[PDB]
Amino acid sequence: AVESTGNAKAEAESRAEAARIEGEGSVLQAKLKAQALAIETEAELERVK
Amino acid sequence: AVESTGNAKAEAESRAEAARIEGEGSVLQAKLKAQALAIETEAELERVK
C-alpha cells in the first residue's frame, strides 16, 4: 500500500509540480506578450493614424 | 519521487526559462520592428503626399 500509493503520489505530484512551473512561466510569458502587443499596436497606431 | 518530480520540474523549468528569454527578445525585436515601420512609413508618407 505505502509503496504503490507512494509511487503514484510522487508521480502525480511531480506532474503537478511541473505543471505549476510551466503555468507560471506561461503567466510571465503572457506578460511579455502583453507588452509586445502593447508597444507594437501602439507604434503601429501612429502609422495607421 | 524526488528524482522523477525533480527531473520533470527541472525540465519544464528549463522550458519556461527559455521561453521567457525568447519572449523578452520578441519584445525588444518588436520594438525595433516598431521603429522600423515607424521611420519607413513616415519617409514613405512624404512620397505619397
Size of interface A-B (CB pairs under 8 A): 84
Closest residue, chain B, to A8 (C-alpha): B1
d(CA B25, CA B31): 10
Q: CB within 8 A of A47, min separation 6: which ones?
A: B37, B38, B41
Nearest-neighbour CA in chain B from A30: distance (Å): 9
Quote the cell numbers at residue A35: 507588452
d(CA B33, CA B41): 12
Query: A34 — contact with chain B (CB < 8 Å)?
Result: no
d(CA A16, CA A13): 5
Total residues belonging to chain A:
49
Q: Give one word for B38, left, alpha or beta, with left for phi > 0 and alpha for psi -120 to 50.
A: alpha
d(CA B11, CA B17): 10
Q: Is A4 helix (H, G, I), strand (E, B) or coil?
A: helix
Q: Which experimental method was this entry solved with?
A: cryo-EM
Closest residue, chain A, to B27 (C-alpha): A36
Nearest-neighbour CA in chain A from B40: distance (Å): 10
